[PDB]
Amino acid sequence: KPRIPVVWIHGLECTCCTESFIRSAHPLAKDVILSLISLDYDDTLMAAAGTQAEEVFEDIITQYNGKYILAVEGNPPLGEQGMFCISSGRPFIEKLKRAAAGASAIIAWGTCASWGCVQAARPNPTQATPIDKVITDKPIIKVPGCPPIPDVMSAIITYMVTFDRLPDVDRMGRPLMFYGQRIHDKCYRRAHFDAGEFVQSWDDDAARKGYCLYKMGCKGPTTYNACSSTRWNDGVSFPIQSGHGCLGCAENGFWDRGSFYSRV
């Protein structure tokens, strides 16, 4: 019984979203690849290189025209005629457009593909641009975070495979299931926020009792993600649980909202 074809391309990025994907605990990434999807192109993991990889790309997008899902990690730079990110000797944006044209839908993994992320922070030397500003005629599901939570990534994939539909999204294209609520609306330190019980300096007595990180710059109050509920790495922790405020990393423009250590 065939598996849905998936093409995973990479623009300017750090590869954290691919690494997050392989951290998935349930389903294991192994079982996603072997049983749930056909991961038919992916530069990080595939055997073929060079001309052999270009043949795979061309063959899949032609054979499965209109039927594959395009996963995109990273983003295209518009500066230097696109040659800040070069793929087979040509601008990455050309590969992005070719892959998008045949896709039934696009998953924009991470803050890079969704919004811009660190390369788009001031002064954005490469004119890094999110996917939805370039591809304007396809369904794009934004799954932001730097990177998104591993088990969120795999849950979105299993939802789509099991239910044979895209997740319902908010006004920004984020799946409601994991991005509908703020970090601060499901944070286990909220009792302390409400009581005015704050960490004031690192490793103070308040920190050693798990008090709220608002005065240390936590951006939980303005950030939509699942970190405080689903948590990270098979439920082991999340930023706030290990003592650092949320940076806001799922939100558009979070690098340029002032210092991470300045209050919301």
Binding site: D43, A48, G50, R189
Partner: protein, 581 residues
């Protein structure tokens, strides 16, 4: 065409030109070109980083306390190492000393990363250069079990297990949806494992893909998440509370118990799965002890890492030795100083950047990152590179040199440095490893050697995890819980102008961040990263970097199928996002 001599090589761009773009099973974007002669031997090699983001530019104007978070996003593969270098750099600039537990925890974070990165590289990135996955379909499951059991005590070795793995591969392939295996190099004559070894290796690929997710749970405990854990200038944010009210809000005994459990499992997997597989690859591919030497018998560099005495970055503290060898003179391991402007310099005469004088190298405190895409006459156009022009600018990667020398960095480099400084554990491990393979010491200076050294280092790092954990627990038993120093957290406490260097050994080699602070903000932030060294383009003297050198003189069986090129490149574990930042 032209020819010239450098570093014992004859660089000759006559003959057929081969292009490999994209290089896959790496992080990020790389292009490689070679020329081959009439005997299908490489006579020219060109390394090209095909991406750039500009973190050094983005960091300007940031609060120094925030810098770690930005530079962590240089790379999600070697995640955490840039944050560590950053907090070290900013602490060195301002004059901050962290508590012992913070140092220990940072060493745990780094050792965790070494274990994870080395493991995933071996299987998921390099493994399919050595293991013919499709050939695993021809293996006898009983003979696979016998082979595995002869190599290791690892439990998972039954004939039924290997049959089940084989059958799952068969069902995966049968409908033609080969996924990551499509259009691979399967059957190439350089695949030398017997079918049983291919099946054992493939089983282990899958086991490693599952297991690697566990290792980073250590980063989640101390750093919140992986990829991209959190850090602070002044120590770590993971406050400790073992025996007081509110320990539920901190690193407590349950959290530490989780860390211990992961350490033990990590060591078990590396020692009983990865180590025997690496030795088996060596046993079946001994000719690769003579291929891909490159600069590893000429010039190697380590900055050192893992300070065991908190806030002391000197030789008596660093558990991983630093030093440099040049001119093939391994009897004189030279000291490295990252502030000396005559030591680390970066050139851009063959890179897509502007300097006021491109014939000179700039120390990173004098560094400039002014991008300039200027490929000259490629065959093609500015937006259609058919053939890079290696006589002019051909990469987004700067060219670092050390006292004007082109250096190799990474596991092999570190192993050579430690061996020749007389580190006893290293001498004993290396000698026992080469004895087991019935190869001379010089066989380590090769593509095969890079793989073997990385595997050995994963074992070393797994041991050090336990050592560091024990050191933390000793402090806690003595009532020493501090994880952060905050005397100089506030900008009003900082020097008006200061500069600092943060350095370490990332999984791929020597990493430095150079930072200058003025008026409470980053004035300059320059990074020189291990793949910058290794994947370097040429310099004004025409000297070639580690990748280009390692590719030189290599025989290709089938020019159109670049397996030999991939093997040697992958043996360095290229990270192109790191290299370019």
């Amino acid at each position: 065409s032209t020819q010239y001599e450098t570093q014992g090589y004859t660089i000759n761009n006559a003959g057929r030109r081969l292009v490999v773009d994209p290089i896959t099973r790496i992080e990020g974007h790389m292009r490689c070109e070679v020329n081959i002669n009439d005997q299908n031997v490489i006579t020219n090699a060109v390394s090209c980083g095909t991406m750039f983001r500009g973190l050094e530019i983005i960091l300007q104007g940031r609060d120094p306390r925030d810098a770690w978070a930005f530079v962590e996003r240089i790379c999600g593969v070697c995640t955490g190492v840039h944050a560590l270098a950053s907090v070290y750099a900013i602490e060195d600039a301002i004059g901050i000393k962290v508590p012992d537990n913070a140092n220990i925890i940072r060493n745990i974070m780094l050792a965790t990363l070494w274990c994870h990165d080395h493991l995933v590289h071996f299987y998921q990135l390099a493994g399919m250069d050595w293991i013919d996955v499709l050939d695993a379909l021809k293996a006898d499951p009983r003979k696979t079990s016998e082979l595995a059991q002869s190599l290791s005590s690892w439990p998972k070795s039954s004939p039924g297990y290997f049959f089940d793995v084989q059958n799952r591969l068969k069902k995966f392939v049968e409908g033609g949806q080969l996924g990551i295996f499509r259009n691979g190099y399967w059957g190439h004559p350089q695949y030398k494992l017997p079918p049983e070894a291919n099946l054992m290796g493939f089983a282990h690929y899958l086991e490693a893909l599952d297991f690697q997710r566990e290792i980073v749970k250590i980063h989640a405990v101390f750093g919140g998440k992986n990829p991209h854990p959190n850090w602070i200038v002044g120590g770590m944010p993971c406050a400790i509370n073992i025996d007081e009210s509110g320990a539920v809000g901190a690193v407590n005994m349950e959290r530490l118990n989780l860390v211990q459990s992961i350490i033990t499992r990590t060591a078990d997997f590396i020692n009983n799965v990865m180590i025997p597989d690496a030795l088996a690859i060596g046993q079946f591919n001994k000719p690769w002890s003579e291929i891909g030497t490159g600069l590893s018998d000429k010039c190697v560099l380590s900055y050192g890492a893992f300070p065991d005495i908190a806030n002391d970055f000197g030789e008596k503290s660093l558990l991983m030795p630093g030093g440099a060898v040049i001119n093939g003179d391994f009897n004189n391991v030279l000291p490295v100083d990252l502030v000396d402007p005559q030591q680390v310099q970066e050139f851009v005469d063959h890179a897509w950047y502007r300097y006021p004088n491109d014939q000179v190298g700039r120390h990173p405190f004098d560094g400039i990152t002014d991008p300039w895409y200027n490929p000259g006459d490629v065959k093609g156009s500015d937006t259609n590179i058919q053939q890079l022009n290696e006589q002019e600018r051909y990469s987004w990667i700067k060219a670092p040199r050390w006292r004007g020398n082109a250096m190799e960095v990474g596991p092999l480099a570190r192993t050579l440095i430690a061996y020749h400084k007389g580190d006893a554990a290293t001498v004993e491990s290396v000698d026992r490893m080469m004895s087991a393979l019935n190869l001379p010491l010089s066989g380590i200076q090769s593509t095969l050697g890079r793989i073997l050294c990385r595997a050995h280092e994963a074992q070393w790092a797994a041991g050090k995890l336990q050592y560091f954990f024990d050191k933390l627990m000793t402090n806690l038993k003595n009532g020493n819980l501090a994880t952060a120093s905050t005397e100089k957290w506030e900008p009003a406490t900082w020097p008006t102008e200061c500069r600092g260097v943060g350095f370490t050994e990332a999984p791929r080699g020597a990493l430095g961040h150079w930072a200058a602070i003025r008026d409470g903000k980053i004035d300059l932030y320059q990074c020189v990263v291990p793949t910058t060294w290794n994947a370097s383009p040429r310099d004004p003297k025409g000297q070639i970097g580690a990748y280009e050198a390692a590719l030189m003189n290599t025989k290709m069986a089938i020019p159109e199928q670049p397996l030999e090129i991939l093997r040697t490149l992958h043996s360095f574990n290229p990270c192109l996002a790191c290299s370019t930042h």
